[PDB]
């Protein structure tokens with residue numbers, strides 16, 4: 001499923017945003 | 028199971044539990060220690076001077092069940108400051124054990 005595979009990337013992006021400092025700075 | 032919504036909610040729960048620990052965990056034995064903190068990814072306890080501090084891979088990670096002995100590390104200098112760099116700031120952190128990939 002393209003949409004489920006895209007949701008999986010979104011989630012990895014969310015995790016990366018957390019590692020980069022999340023709501024504090026974040027990217 | 029893939030869900031952005033579920034993973035965000037697990038992160039919020041990890042954050043809520045972390046805040047509770049930061050508020051309620053008793054002070055360290057000594058006056059020398061690196062201070063507890065939530066860095067948005069992991070919850071850090073107070074650090075013992077001159078030591079590595081290891082915390083379990085955050086259990087919100089979609090792949091947390093693949094890494095259930097993995098740790099993330101910080102280093103508490105001699106000193107009572109988190110090892111940083113700074114070029115630039117932000118404490119040194121090793122989270123390689125908690126990465127999703129094989130290979």
Ligand SMILES: CCCCCCCCCCS[C@@H]1O[C@H](CO)[C@@H](O[C@H]2O[C@H](CO)[C@@H](O)[C@H](O)[C@H]2O)[C@H](O)[C@H]1O
Pocket residue numbers: 079080081098100
């Ligand atoms: C410049 C290179 C110098 C590196 C110095 C080496 C010592 C630093 C170690 C980091 S703190 C250390 O991490 C451990 C978790 O990895 C921690 O051990 C934990 O996990 C173990 C995995 O072997 C497990 O077998 C143990 O039952 C469990 O206690 C250990 O407590 C911690 O001090």
